[PDB]
Amino acid sequence: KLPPVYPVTVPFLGHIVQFGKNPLEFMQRCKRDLKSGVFTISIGGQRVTIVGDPHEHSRFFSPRNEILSPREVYTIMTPVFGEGVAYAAPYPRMREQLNFLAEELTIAKFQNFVPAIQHEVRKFMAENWKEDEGVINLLEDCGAMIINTACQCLFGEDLRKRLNARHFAQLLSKMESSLIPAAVFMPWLLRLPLPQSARCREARAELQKILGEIIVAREKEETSDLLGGLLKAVYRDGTRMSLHEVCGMIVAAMFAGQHTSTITTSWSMLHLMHPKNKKWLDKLHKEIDEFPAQLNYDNVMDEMPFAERCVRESIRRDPPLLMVMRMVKAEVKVGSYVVPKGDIIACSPLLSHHDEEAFPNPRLWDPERDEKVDGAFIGFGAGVHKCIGQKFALLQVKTILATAFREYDFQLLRDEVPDPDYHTMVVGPTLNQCLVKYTRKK
Amino acid sequence: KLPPVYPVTVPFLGHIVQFGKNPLEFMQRCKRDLKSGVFTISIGGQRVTIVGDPHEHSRFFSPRNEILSPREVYTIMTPVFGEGVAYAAPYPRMREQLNFLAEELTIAKFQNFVPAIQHEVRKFMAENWKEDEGVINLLEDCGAMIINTACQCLFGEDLRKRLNARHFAQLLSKMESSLIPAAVFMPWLLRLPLPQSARCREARAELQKILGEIIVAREKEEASDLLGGLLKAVYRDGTRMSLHEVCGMIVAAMFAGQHTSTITTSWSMLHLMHPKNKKWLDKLHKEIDEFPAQLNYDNVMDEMPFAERCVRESIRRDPPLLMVMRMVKAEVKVGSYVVPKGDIIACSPLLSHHDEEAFPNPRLWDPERDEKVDGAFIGFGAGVHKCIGQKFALLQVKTILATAFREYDFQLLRDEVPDPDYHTMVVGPTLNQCLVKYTRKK
Numbered sequence A: 001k002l003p004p005v006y007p008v009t010v011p012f013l014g015h016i017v018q019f020g021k022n023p024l025e026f027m028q029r030c031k032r033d034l035k036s037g038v039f040t041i042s043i044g045g046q047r048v049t050i051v052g053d054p055h056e057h058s059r060f061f062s063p064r065n066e067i068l069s070p071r072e073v074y075t076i077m078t079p080v081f082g083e084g085v086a087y088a089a090p091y092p093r094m095r096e097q098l099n100f101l102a103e104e105l106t107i108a109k110f111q112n113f114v115p116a117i118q119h120e121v122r123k124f125m126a127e128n129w130k131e132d133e134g135v136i137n138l139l140e141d142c143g144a145m146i147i148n149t150a151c152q153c154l155f156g157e158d159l160r161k162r163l164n165a166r167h168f169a170q171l172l173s174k175m176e177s178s179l180i181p182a183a184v185f186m187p188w189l190l191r192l193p194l195p196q197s198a199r200c201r202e203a204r205a206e207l208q209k210i211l212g213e214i215i216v217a218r219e220k221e222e223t224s225d226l227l228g229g230l231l232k233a234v235y236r237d238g239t240r241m242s243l244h245e246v247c248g249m250i251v252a253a254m255f256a257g258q259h260t261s262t263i264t265t266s267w268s269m270l271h272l273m274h275p276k277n278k279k280w281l282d283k284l285h286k287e288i289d290e291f292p293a294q295l296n297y298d299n300v301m302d303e304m305p306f307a308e309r310c311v312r313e314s315i316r317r318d319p320p321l322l323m324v325m326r327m328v329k330a331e332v333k334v335g336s337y338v339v340p341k342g343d344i345i346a347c348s349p350l351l352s353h354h355d356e357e358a359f360p361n362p363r364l365w366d367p368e369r370d371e372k373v374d375g376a377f378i379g380f381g382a383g384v385h386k387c388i389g390q391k392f393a394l395l396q397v398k399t400i401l402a403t404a405f406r407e408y409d410f411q412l413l414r415d416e417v418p419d420p421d422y423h424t425m426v427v428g429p430t431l432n433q434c435l436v437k438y439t440r441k442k
Numbered sequence B: 001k002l003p004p005v006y007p008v009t010v011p012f013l014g015h016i017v018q019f020g021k022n023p024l025e026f027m028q029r030c031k032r033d034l035k036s037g038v039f040t041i042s043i044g045g046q047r048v049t050i051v052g053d054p055h056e057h058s059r060f061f062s063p064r065n066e067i068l069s070p071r072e073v074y075t076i077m078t079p080v081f082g083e084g085v086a087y088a089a090p091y092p093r094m095r096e097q098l099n100f101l102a103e104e105l106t107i108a109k110f111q112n113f114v115p116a117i118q119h120e121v122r123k124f125m126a127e128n129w130k131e132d133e134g135v136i137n138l139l140e141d142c143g144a145m146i147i148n149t150a151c152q153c154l155f156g157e158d159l160r161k162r163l164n165a166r167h168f169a170q171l172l173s174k175m176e177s178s179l180i181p182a183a184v185f186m187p188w189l190l191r192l193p194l195p196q197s198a199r200c201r202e203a204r205a206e207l208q209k210i211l212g213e214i215i216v217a218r219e220k221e222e223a224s225d226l227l228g229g230l231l232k233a234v235y236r237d238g239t240r241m242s243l244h245e246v247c248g249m250i251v252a253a254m255f256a257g258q259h260t261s262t263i264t265t266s267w268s269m270l271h272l273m274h275p276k277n278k279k280w281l282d283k284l285h286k287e288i289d290e291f292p293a294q295l296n297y298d299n300v301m302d303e304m305p306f307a308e309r310c311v312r313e314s315i316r317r318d319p320p321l322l323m324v325m326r327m328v329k330a331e332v333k334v335g336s337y338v339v340p341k342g343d344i345i346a347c348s349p350l351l352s353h354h355d356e357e358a359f360p361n362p363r364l365w366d367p368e369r370d371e372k373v374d375g376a377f378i379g380f381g382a383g384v385h386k387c388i389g390q391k392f393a394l395l396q397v398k399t400i401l402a403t404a405f406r407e408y409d410f411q412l413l414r415d416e417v418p419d420p421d422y423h424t425m426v427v428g429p430t431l432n433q434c435l436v437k438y439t440r441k442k
């Protein structure tokens, strides 16, 4: 009573070599040659049992933290959010902090956002794309837009004054370097010592100070932004959040967005500018060219169903997070087989989204397709741990698309849509392939 | 026939804990408790045989690459020198390129360099050492001198304009930041995905980009410096280097020299300024006082043996590169032992430089000492891998010493010469502890 195991050769390594090079081919091979969408592979010592049977998704997603803990797995972030925050925190507290972040992320907050985004994007666009035409690296240029957009939306003029978009980004990288995504199956790796940590901490500590002073002054002035929103939060204890915690929460939110949203906006534009996709590109202007030159919340939330399909397709074909994963607290039946505690269990957006019985012709970016298995899309995952950023993220992205594609016209400098570069922890179009030429529509 | 195993407290990650924190004391302990120079340890899962017996240095330094292989552990450098460049390349081509480099930093070409050096030092002192006396951190100050003076000798005026030492020391920093040291003992870590972390990327590119522009200007204005030399280098193939390689070579030349050369100038001054060591400091002054202000080539190269001994002794007692290692591609004879393929064979200068037979009372800084086992000293490595920069590196430091001590005196704000901080990958005197006060001669 246990899933088929894909045989190992270089024993102390296990499957890392193959899995590192191309995760999909490998996990596909695994599935095919084992004749099961549920299978176990090995990273170093660690057993890892994967779920690429969409018919099984619920099994991974639905069970309680009691049965599968996302903590022992994501404690690789702990340098970045700080001790006793998020997965460091105890379950109830972890759960609690997450709600606080969600509530500051619900639609209600959004009404001001749509113009805010448009303002930044245009600002960047006019500021950074000044000719009738020119050459830009889309992914790079996109990313700045994403970081600017979030801040406009989530921080206050006061904060922006003490924390300019560009510099917030650098701060965030610094922590980023502290991470070894390897340890997610190998913690003692977490135990190894890294120089980066120093920079991460400096950066992290430094930030707080900026927060502090901003906070303190605000108190004296006595605001509706995320931070402020976060402060007013209170636990089931009835205790307020600490300035450590408020930093960690901000940071998580900042972290999740920067790459993942930025990547998706890029993937989406790359597809639409592709001549082969021109029909799809046209069926977009059908949707957005009658719009005001000042987009409104409704335009995007309720009046933009096509693009959402695009943005979703992008995320289906090229999920930026290949794996979501848990530790197994107790044996839980999945499919025929049973999984013992001690196993990293893990479900893949990558493997699951390429499932022929669920997404036939999976490398084909067909926006108007739908899953053909129930809950076989998991780009924002599912269950308790379903994304609490998707609405904001999607909103952000749609606004961006409409804005850029209203004024500017783009040509990809390549025969084909760039390949995925799988060598980063968040997976994106290959950086050097993302050179695009724009032409001012005007 | 196997070197003995130093026993294993923790199976998951071996000795990296102790070795990490204090390497010398650990290796010595191994060496003693095991009653052998040659002994094996466990990092990650991986076996690591250390040839710690100066009598056997030739057995580690003489086999050819295709037997004891350097590349399989310097993979952490591929992004910095670049793909297919240096260790990235195959061994015969690697050879070619390194020979190209050596041919650049050979005593033949050193003519103009000393005045070049003196100028920069005399330049530097004025910009910082203004008062009749004052307070400095040595390491940061030798750090600046080593890098300033390298770019003077090694780059010609036009490059200097487009790229000055302060800025170029910046680029190096970013790339250096990119490195993960755990990756030497576990290079497989680089197979699995990693955070993006590439200012370095920008850095290599900016450097490459800049050089590129420079070549055109020269080519353009034909109607030389180091860069000049690489641009005439021809392979046995008959080709010449790509910009990509040319660039990767300059990155090699500075990167190598910055910390090592710097530690040594600093370690040496600390030793020489120390109240105890006057005997030598004075002896050096004898050596250094027959000298006109404007030092020349002959002066440093052939009129400074004492200074040279001081410098070697510093390296000897405290080498900046603790350990070098290859990958055992096929078993090798080491003394009574045979070391099986797969192992990371390593040879440690720190360890070697503290073998009691070869250097008596090792922690004592004795410039007039002499290796009582031949070739004990490996601070510049040996055999097929002798450091190709030593002559330049010695000339560089010697000149600084001869320049600095003549117009200054120094005192160190501790009873003892600083400790070595073994936490960085290049190992130098503990940063804070290197605090000094100086006074002009007259």
Ligand code: HEM
Binding pocket: A070, A098, A101, A105, A252, A253, A254, A256, A257, A260, A261, A264, A315, A320, A321, A324, A325, A378, A379, A380, A381, A382, A384, A385, A386, A387, A388, A389, A390, A392, A393
């Ligand atoms: C394109 C954008 C995004 C993608 C593709 C994405 C993807 C995902 C996925 C797959 C999960 C499920 C994790 C699991 O089940 O283990 C998830 C959860 C989550 N995401 Fe996102 N996400 C995005 C944006 C955001 C943003 C902007 C935030 C900002 C707060 C955010 C915060 C979170 C949080 C807090 C969770 C749940 C953590 C937990 O419950 O353990 N995400 N996201």
Ligand code: HEM
Binding pocket: B070, B098, B101, B105, B252, B253, B254, B256, B257, B258, B260, B261, B264, B315, B319, B320, B321, B324, B325, B378, B379, B380, B381, B382, B384, B385, B386, B387, B388, B389, B390, B392, B393
């Ligand atoms: C105190 C100063 C220096 C020390 C202690 C030092 C030390 C060493 C050591 C120990 C090796 C052998 C490493 C091994 O076995 O893998 C070596 C090799 C080398 N060093 Fe240095 N070095 C110094 C300065 C320089 C400088 C200034 C350069 C400038 C280009 C340089 C370039 C090299 C190169 C190219 C090698 C090639 C080794 C090979 O063939 O694989 N070094 N150095």
Ligand SMILES: O=C(N[C@H](Cc1c[nH]c2ccccc12)C(=O)Nc1ccncc1)c1ccc(-c2cc(F)ccc2F)cc1F
Binding pocket: A074, A076, A077, A181, A182, A184, A252, A253, A255, A256, A257, A260, A321, A322, A323, A387, A425, A426, B192, B193
């Ligand atoms: O970067 C990663 N995760 C971070 C951090 C994170 C985890 N829980 C979060 C909740 C909120 C915010 C951030 C995080 C993030 O920002 N994830 C995120 C973003 C948005 N929503 C949910 C999650 C990450 C990327 C890759 C891997 C990985 C490693 C492998 F060996 C192989 C394949 C892989 F894919 C592991 C990772 F941990």
Ligand SMILES: O=C(N[C@H](Cc1c[nH]c2ccccc12)C(=O)Nc1ccncc1)c1ccc(-c2cc(F)ccc2F)cc1F
Binding pocket: B074, B077, B184, B252, B253, B255, B256, B257, B260, B321, B322, B323, B324, B325, B387, B425, B426
């Ligand atoms: O930082 C390192 N190497 C860089 C870059 C570099 C590598 N190959 C080169 C050849 C020529 C020029 C530069 C380099 C450098 O500048 N080395 C250098 C400089 C001058 N000469 C020779 C070499 C470095 C330092 C320590 C360790 C190490 C530490 C341990 F605990 C145990 C075992 C180890 F091995 C590993 C390292 F990779």
